[PDB]
Swiss-Prot record, chain B:
Superkingdom to which the source organism belongs: Eukaryota
Site (Reactive bond for trypsin): residue numbering on this chain: 15-16
Upper taxonomic lineage: Eukaryota, Metazoa, Chordata, Craniata, Vertebrata
Record bears the keyword Protein biosynthesis: no
Domain BPTI/Kunitz inhibitor as annotated: residue spans: 5-55
GO process terms (BP): negative regulation of platelet aggregation; negative regulation of serine-type endopeptidase activity; negative regulation of thrombin-activated receptor signaling pathway; trypsinogen activation
Record keyword Repressor present: no
One Gene Ontology term of the molecular function aspect: zymogen binding
Cysteine disulfide links: 5-55, 14-38, 30-51
Organism: Bos taurus (Bovine)
Full-protein residues shown: 36 to 90 of 100
Protein name (record): Pancreatic trypsin inhibitor
Key words of the record: Disulfide bond, Pharmaceutical, Protease inhibitor, Secreted, Serine protease inhibitor, Signal
Localization terms from the record: Secreted
Role summary: Inhibits trypsin, kallikrein, chymotrypsin, and plasmin.
A GO term from the CC aspect: extracellular space
Length: 38, 55, 601
């Protein structure tokens, strides 16, 4: 039912741009490895 | 029909793409939505059958 | 974490599904496919290069391996920027750099990134400055803002054994159920530290295929497989001897150079085979002598009674009527089910009837018996099938990728009758033992992927194997095994009350013992028959006793009075002086025995 396909190789791109933020949020894990908000 | 059929289709906080079925409470039938992989609500079926049978 | 259970490329990949949808992403590093649990949940990874199956699975952390453990150790250091190699459905890969925030869980904290990519980017590698994968994108949470934040999920990485299991004059019984990583995790660790203690280690497998699986699991370690074609084989180098239970017993019966193994491990130590019971007796004696430590690994230790032990994967226990022979209708649930099924039959004949019946409805069927096991079991994986119709032989380490087991809980039992002329009959079909039922059921409930394995059974087990011939036969074998002065080799404790036979009543003279061994290992005769012939002073080549028997010892085949042409060229009726049912139980056994009676074996 599942097939695979080549995409890329593990490499750090020096020409990449910076985005995103760095906040601190309280997580509460679960048995299935999920996440929630404490 | 159950009270979780109330709920809109819920793509969870995971980033996979697993096509599932939700009971539309808008139109009156069942139809596909994208499931994330984790934290599935009850309004989430692996087939159009189960969705139509439950609701 | 946890292990898995089943009998080349480079880079990151799009995990695609048929129904060419993309469902997730993975990373092939070190020769292992790394991906997230919620993406596949243990589903097979089919590709041109073949297939990949689960190996390591930490559901509590949403991670899963394909083709080995995980060589992904590089973790974030709370003060360094990373990239996410996002591979979205229907788009070229992207490298998004973001200095990570923190997921302060309840216990305790792990790095996380505020990136929001399309569904199907689960498993996208988070990259180091050195160019190493540092975690997986795909498992996160939404905040009060409605913004998405994913965590940098990362693995951390065997079995630490107790020291007193190596202590002499100690016999430890390890209760290991299917899916414990017994063969792949426990045993290699045991051997590994056994070598560190410089111990002379002996490993015993019930069959050749199990020993082969051990070799697979013990690669890189100094293991030498020992064949029954060799009485003894000593090398100066440090080494672990791997052999079958029967090989060990044979060497005990025919060799003088049997080394003092101070650590003996027997896998599937519930094997009720005469050679196995005798082996357990000898091993127990060596332990009692304070010369060795012993480890008996089995899912059904002495005292086991529960036919429904808990498995690592859910088992549906269904009780209903099961066909004893071929059928025409009224059992649609058997054929309409097309997962793979393992059907346990009381005998080879009943197996033949069932197998033929299944084949006549378009079902691919593989049959398994005692003598065809080491040849026919390997094709239960290199080929694909619908039903494995097997005898009790599959209750010893035989691993199938099946979803259902059909178990009418019946079997045959060899019994030694003393109604005047001593004889051996096959009593049955009678109910199996609770342990046997547990082991037959144990063929499934092993795969963490499937959560709906079915154990279809009928009737109840019965603890009535006191009159089983194997206990007596084991005593026959064990009586012809030399021991020091005062030390008498009796059966294994919990198995000795089963027999009423006294000690040493079967010890044979020097040459007659050799005849006994040859009759068993070259004539392929049962222990009882071999003992009866050898104790009578009869040589191996003398086959006259096959025709000397009384009238009712006449052997039948297909309702015919069997007749044999001897090597000299004389036509005699097959009528053995001593009658053992097991030599005319099934066609092949009768063929072999007829070859023996002709003097052509």
């Amino acid at each position: 039912d599942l097939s695979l396909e080549k995409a890329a190789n593990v490499q750090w791109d020096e020409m990449a741009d910076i985005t995103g933020s760095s906040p601190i949020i309280e997580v509460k894990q679960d048995e299935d490895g999920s996440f929630s908000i404490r | 029909r159950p009270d979780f059929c109330l709920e809109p289709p819920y793509t969870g906080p995971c980033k996979a793409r697993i096509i599932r079925y939700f009971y539309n409470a808008k139109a009156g039938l069942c139809q596909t939505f994208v499931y994330g992989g984790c934290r599935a609500k009850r309004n989430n079926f692996k087939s159009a059958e189960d969705c139509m049978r439950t609701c | 974490g946890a292990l898995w259970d089943v009998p080349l490329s480079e880079g990151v990949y799009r995990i695609m599904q048929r129904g060419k949808t993309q469902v997730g992403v993975g990373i092939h590093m070190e020769g292992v496919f790394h991906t997230m649990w919620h993406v596949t949940r243990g589903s097979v990874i089919c590709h041109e290069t073949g297939r990949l199956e689960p190996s390591w699975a930490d559901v509590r952390n949403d991670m899963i391996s394909y083709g080995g453990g995980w060589r992904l150790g590089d973790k974030w250091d709370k003060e360094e920027d990373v990239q996410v190699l996002a591979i979205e459905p229907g788009k070229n890969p992207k490298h998004v750099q973001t200095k990570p925030g923190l997921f302060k869980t309840l216990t305790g904290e792990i790095g996380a990134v505020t990136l929001d990519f399309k569904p199907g980017t689960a498993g996208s590698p988070i990259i180091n400055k050195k160019g190493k994968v540092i975690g997986l994108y795909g498992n996160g949470v939404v905040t009060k803002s409605g913004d998405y934040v994913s965590a940098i999920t990362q693995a951390e990485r065997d079995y630490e054994v107790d020291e007193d299991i190596f202590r002499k004059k100690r016999l430890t019984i390890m209760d290991l159920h299917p899916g414990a990583g017994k063969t792949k995790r426990i045993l290699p660790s045991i051997v590994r530290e056994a070598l560190k203690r410089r111990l002379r280690t002996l490993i015993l497998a019930p069959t050749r295929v199990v020993a082969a699986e051990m070799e697979e699991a013990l690669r890189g370690l100094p293991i030498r497989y020992q064949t029954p074609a060799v009485k003894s084989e000593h090398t100066g180098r440090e080494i672990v001897d791997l052999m079958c239970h029967a090989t060990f017993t044979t060497r005990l019966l025919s060799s003088t150079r049997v080394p003092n193994y101070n650590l003996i491990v027997m896998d599937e130590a519930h094997f009720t085979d005469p050679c196995s019971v005798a082996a357990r007796g000898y091993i127990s004696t060596r332990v009692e002598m304070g010369e060795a430590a012993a480890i008996f690994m089995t899912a059904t230790p002495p005292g086991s009674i529960d036919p429904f032990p808990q498995s690592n994967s859910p088992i549906e226990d269904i009780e209903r009527e099961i066909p004893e022979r071929s059928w025409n209708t009224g059992f649609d649930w058997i054929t309409d089910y097309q997962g793979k099924t393992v059907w346990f039959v009381p005998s080879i004949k009943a197996g033949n009837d069932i197998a033929n019946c299944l084949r006549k409805s378009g079902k691919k069927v593989i049959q398994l018996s005692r003598k065809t096991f080491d040849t026919e079991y390997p094709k239960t994986k290199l080929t694909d099938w619908d039903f494995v119709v097997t005898t009790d032989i599959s209750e010893m380490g035989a691993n199938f990728r099946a979803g259902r087991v059909i178990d009418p809980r019946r079997c045959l039992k060899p019994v030694i009758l003393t109604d005047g002329p001593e004889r051996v009959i096959l009593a049955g079909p009678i109910p199996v033992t609770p342990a046997s039922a547990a082991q037959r059921r144990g063929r499934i409930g092993r795969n963490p992927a499937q959560e709906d394995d079915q154990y279809v059974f009928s009737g109840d087990p019965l603890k009535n194997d006191e009159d089983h011939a194997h206990w007596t036969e084991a005593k026959m074998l064990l009586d012809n095994i030399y021991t020091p002065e005062g030390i008498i080799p009796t059966l294994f404790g919990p198995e000795r009350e089963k027999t009423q036979a006294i000690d040493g009543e079967f010890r044979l003279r020097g040459e007659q013992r050799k005849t006994f061994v040859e009759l068993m290992r070259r004539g392929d005769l049962p222990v009882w028959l071999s003992y009866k012939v050898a104790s009578a002073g009869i040589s191996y080549k003398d086959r006259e006793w096959c025709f000397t028997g009384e009238r009712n010892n006449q052997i039948l085949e297909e309702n015919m009075e069997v007749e044999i042409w001897t090597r000299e060229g004389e036509k005699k009726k097959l009528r053995p002086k001593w009658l053992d049912a097991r030599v005319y139980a099934d066609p092949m056994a009768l063929k072999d025995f007829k070859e023996f009676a002709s003097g052509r074996k």
